[PDB]
Amino acid sequence: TRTNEKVELQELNDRFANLIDKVRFLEQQNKILLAELEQLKGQGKSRLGDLYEEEMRELRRQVDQLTNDKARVEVERDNLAEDIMRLREKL
Amino acid sequence: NEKVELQELNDRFANLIDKVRFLEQQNKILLAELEQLKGQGKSRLGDLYEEEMRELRRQVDQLTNDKARVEVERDNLAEDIMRLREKL
């Protein structure tokens, strides 16, 4: 008879209603998951960006040092160029 | 408030369905175009960092040699002067 029907249907609609609730929770959960993931990506990229920056910053610091080193050794060499230029005029 | 006949409403929503499909296709083209642009900008930024580091290494190399020479001249000038005081 159609009394079975009435039973099964009521059960089943409650089941749908249940899944519905759970799938909407699945959604809250996913949303949060995505937020976490965004946070983790941003750290990873932050850091990686730190390492690329460092590499460059090192080459720069080195260039400036080298540049000052050479500049000291030049002050010295140029001080000696005036010396031979004078002493040759005493010869 | 003008009222519409049903067979007329079907027309208007049939046409609106056309228009919407069209926007779908546009938006599609756009999404691919953007995706490419994105990709290209990633490549561009890579390159820019790349060239900066190449140019910098060139500079380190250049300066390291330039400084070794000038040290040599300095030493040479030291020698010449000392032996030049030797004569006079």
Method of structure determination: X-ray
DSSP letter, residue B1: -
Reported resolution in A? 2.5
Write out B39-71 in H/E/C secondary structure: HHHHHHHHHHHHHHHHHHHHHHHHHHHHHHHHH
- Which residue in the set A60, A69, A87 is minimally distant from B81, CB to CB? A87
- Which residue in the set B57, B70, B85 is minimally distant from A74, CB to CB? B70
Residue A69 CB partners (closer than 8 Å, separation 6+)? B67
Per CB-CB distance under 8 Å, the chain A contacts of B70 are 70, 73-74, 77
Domain layout of chain A by residue ranges: 1-91
CB B62 within 8 A of CB A67: no
B71 has a chain A CB within 8 A of its CB? yes
Give the whole-angstrom CA distance, residue B16 versus residue B38: 32
Q: Which residue of A has its CA nearest to B83?
A: A84
Contact A80 B85 (CB under 8 A): no
